[PDB]
From Swiss-Prot:
It is found in: Secreted. This is Phospholipase A2. Binds 1 Ca(2+) ion per subunit. It comes from Bos taurus. GO terms for cellular component: cell surface; extracellular space. One of its GO terms (molecular function) is phospholipid binding. The keyword S-adenosyl-L-methionine does not apply. The chain holds residues 23 to 145 of 145 of the full protein. Secretory calcium-dependent phospholipase A2 that primarily targets dietary phospholipids in the intestinal tract. Hydrolyzes the ester bond of the fatty acyl group attached at sn-2 position of phospholipids (phospholipase A2 activity) with preference for phosphatidylethanolamines and phosphatidylglycerols over phosphatidylcholines. May play a role in the biosynthesis of N-acyl ethanolamines that regulate energy metabolism and inflammation in the intestinal tract.
Length: 123
């Protein structure tokens, strides 16, 4: 679930404010997204967006009910390291890995504040 993805990002980047820092950034960081990613962070979000789309089409995920935004799963934060629990069902495990991969990706790319609030004409 979204609030859990927030926790994952905090796990990897303690000094960050997820819902603020990684929203309205580039062409993909935020609700929706299309076009050409402006930098590596934007590419992280593009990959995450595609991952969420796959989850919604996944056979193991029930129609709304198991959507990526509100479907809670089990995960752990150990020394700034994320772990998806083997207690998760197939649907939850897929979503948890979508988030885990993105959290890690965010932590390995530079943050360029000049890419915030870009108009669609730049995508
Ligand atoms: Ca997006
Ligand atoms: Ca669940």
């Amino acid at each position: 679930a979204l609030w859990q993805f927030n926790g994952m990002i905090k796990c990897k980047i303690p000094s960050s404010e997820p819902l603020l820092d990684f929203n309205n950034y580039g062409c993909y960081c935020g609700l929706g997204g299309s076009g050409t990613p402006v930098d590596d962070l934007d590419r992280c979000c593009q990959t995450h967006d595609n991952c969420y789309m796959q989850a919604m089409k996944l056979d193991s995920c029930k129609v709304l009910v198991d959507n990526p935004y509100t479907n809670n799963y089990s995960y752990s934060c150990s020394n700034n390291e994320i772990t998806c629990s083997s207690e998760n069902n197939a649907c939850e495990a897929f979503i948890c890995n979508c988030d885990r991969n993105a959290a890690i990706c965010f932590s390995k790319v530079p943050y360029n504040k000049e890419h915030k609030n870009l108009d669609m004409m730049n995508c």
